[PDB]
C-alpha cells in the first residue's frame, strides 16, 4: 500500500504537485512557482491508513538501552548478538489501538538491536 511523502522541485526546492498530462495521458509533477515539468514514477498520489496499524518497533531507538529507569532481564537473550541483558518496555506510543506488547532493546553498545516477541 505504500506511503507517498513530499517531493520537491529541483529548480526552486518548492513542493511538487501532481498533474495529469491530457495529451499523452501520463502523470507529471509540477510547481506553481516554476514551469518545471517532471515525470512521476509511482502512479499513486495520496494514501490514508484508517485502521492505522503502525510498526512501533521501528521507532524504538538503540539509545534507550542505557536508560537507568528501565527494567532489565537476562531471561530474554538478544536474538541478534546473543547478549543476555535486554531492557523491555511497552509501546509507549499514544493512540496505540489496544496493546500491552513488549519491545526489547539489547544492552550492548553498537549492537543496538530492537526486537519484539
Amino acid at each position: 500500500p505504500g506511503f507517498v511523502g513530499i517531493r520537491f522541485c529541483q529548480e526552486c526546492n518548492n513542493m511538487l504537485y501532481p498533474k495529469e498530462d491530457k495529451e499523452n495521458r501520463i502523470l507529471l509533477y509540477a510547481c506553481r512557482n516554476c514551469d518545471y515539468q517532471q515525470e512521476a514514477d509511482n502512479s499513486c498520489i495520496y494514501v490514508n491508513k484508517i485502521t492505522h496499524e503502525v510498526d512501533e518497533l521501528t521507532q524504538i531507538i538503540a539509545d534507550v538501552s542505557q536508560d537507568p529507569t528501565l527494567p532489565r532481564t537476562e531471561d530474554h537473550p538478544c536474538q541478534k548478538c546473543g547478549h543476555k541483558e535486554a531492557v523491555f518496555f511497552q509501546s509507549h506510543s499514544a493512540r496505540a489501538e489496544d496493546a500491552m506488547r513488549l519491545y526489547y532493546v539489547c544492552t550492548a553498545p553498537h549492537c543496538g538491536h530492537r526486537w519484539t516477541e
Binding site: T69, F89, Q90, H92
Partner: protein
Amino acid sequence: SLSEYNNFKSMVVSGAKGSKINISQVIAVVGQQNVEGKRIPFGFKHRTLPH
C-alpha cells in the same frame, strides 16, 4: 478472628460507629487507593514514582 470482647466488633455490630471495612483496614489490609476511579496514574513518565 476477633474475640467476643473485641471493642471494634462491639461498636460495629451495635451499628453505633464504624463498619466491617474499617476493621478490615485496621487489622488485615488497607487495600487499593483509587483517584478518579482508576488505580494511581502515571504521574511521571510511565511510572507512578521515581522509586
